[PDB]
Write a protein that binds this ligand. Sequence first.
Ligand code: HEM
Length: 345
Amino acid sequence: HRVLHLRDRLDLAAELKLLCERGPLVRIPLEDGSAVHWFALGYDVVREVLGSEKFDKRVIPGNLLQLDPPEHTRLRRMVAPAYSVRRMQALEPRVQAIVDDHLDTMASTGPPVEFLREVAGPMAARVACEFLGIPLDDRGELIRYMRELAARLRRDPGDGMLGMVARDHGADISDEELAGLCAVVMNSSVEQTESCLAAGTLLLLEHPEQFALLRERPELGEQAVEEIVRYLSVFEGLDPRTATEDVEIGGQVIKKGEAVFCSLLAANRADDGFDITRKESRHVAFGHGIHHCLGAPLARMELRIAFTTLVSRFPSLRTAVPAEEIRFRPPSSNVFTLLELPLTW
Ligand code: HEM
């Protein structure tokens, strides 16, 4: 369903805008008759689908996204406390210092920099290691095996999320499951986070009035992050939800066995101007329901710290090429991202 990923730079492509005019829930019978699929394109309908207990994540270790209740509930309940408010507050100054480390490197290497590979990527990966409690001597290689690392950490719990889980649920979670929890954080989550960091920096640079506003008013940081994750929608479309029974959604009956594809991109953008003064953003960039992004507290905190510090430390920041020359990854189910971001200051 490639149409759900068609963009014009950061915006929706005409072809996808045209599809969204067909309504927030679109029936898509397959040309071969093999199945009936649905596109959930609107904010309310996507929330209706994702909140419903009448869908599973069937195909048509430690990876929560591939589990349905009750097994999903069991594992999520064990890892959830690592993202409490009390955990993020204790972590914030250390995240601030990691951000500062990387903007230190940047300000000393001097311009230009390829912001994605040289700053955003390493920063996100280093924050993830800190959150997970990866031993310092393992971080270089991990960022550059998983079962071995997870088994050693399980043998002697340390700090961070992996230590909490092993300490508090040692017997209940296997080596491979603990390794899987680590991999999801270090792989997909870093991809999404680094993309937000780099493309969000571009978005701010393309709205210089708001780049400056966030420097003058750092208290806008939390609002800015919500507007940035809404506007970017780097996680564009979700794994299909298959109805386990007939269910009425947005006025239509989705029959047992039919698959629904939620487009966070369309839900976040099809209604929109980028504005960090918005006090509350209408978006589903982190999903909704039992699979709602477990990392959202961390992502929100890391991005707030990163964007606020960046605009403060680099008021002269600018793209080293015309914005219109930036390359974006072509339509794919993979995370949306630019390919490189040359900056100068
Ligand atoms: C801006 C960055 C991020 C975005 C936009 C994002 C987005 C999402 C979305 C939309 C989902 C739901 C997928 C679905 O329901 O099919 C999800 C799930 C998940 N995310 Fe994130 N994510 C981000 C960063 C992170 C981080 C930093 C972590 C961990 C440190 C993380 C860990 C997870 C996990 C474990 C799940 C699965 C939860 C479950 O299935 O119960 N994500 N994310």
